[PDB]
Each structure stands twice: as C-alpha cells, then as structure tokens.
Amino acid sequence: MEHVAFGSEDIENTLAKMDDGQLDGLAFGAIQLDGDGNILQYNAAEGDITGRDPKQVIGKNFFKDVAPCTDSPEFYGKFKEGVASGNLNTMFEYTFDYQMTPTKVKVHMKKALSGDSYWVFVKRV
C-alpha cells in the first residue's frame, strides 16, 4: 500500500514520483489522461472497480472509446474546460454504467504537475 489519501491537497506532487507499479499500490482508482483524453496510466484499483484490464485500455481514448457514459457536460465538459484553461480541480459523484453493473463513485479530477497531463481519481461511495 502506498499511503496517499483520496482528495489530498498535494496529491499531484505525491503521484509525480510513482511508476506504474507504485500507482497499483494506491487505495483508490487512478487514471492519467493527456489533453486529448487518451489514457496514459490506469492502475489496478480502477480495474477492480470497473472490470477493465489496465494494460488493454492504455492508449485508448477515455471519452470516445472506454467510457462513453462520461461523454456529457457533467464529466467530459468539465475536463475539456480544464484542459483549455490549464487548471482543473473538481470533485463530484457519478455513476459508471457502460457494459457493467451501474456503480456509484466519487470522482476527483486534477491537473497533473507535468505539462499536459490530467488525473482522474475514483473511489466507491
């Protein structure tokens, strides 16, 4: 277990040091996206929540391919505003329901420390 709390003020500083293997030790789901929504990282906790195989979704587009239920003003719309603004920090509840049992989650999106990367953090509620 990597000891980082969901919603920590400086989470993007803490996660900047972690390889794929360390990300898999987190207590919550973590996805790293580029500015276009392509998945750069996807940890084991997230695969446990959603059923997706982490290695097979890297390189796919989260909003177009993997998670079409997030293609809406309430999720994707907030992401694209943050990318265009260069700043993003928002937390909200959502239901994941594509090809899965509908699962309610808390979502935290935050701009990463590195240039053109954005974190999506997920935990059950």
Ligand SMILES: *C(=O)/C=C/c1ccc(O)cc1
């Ligand atoms: C809605 O289609 C959500 C799908 C989804 C959310 C999060 C993931 O990690 C994978 C699929």
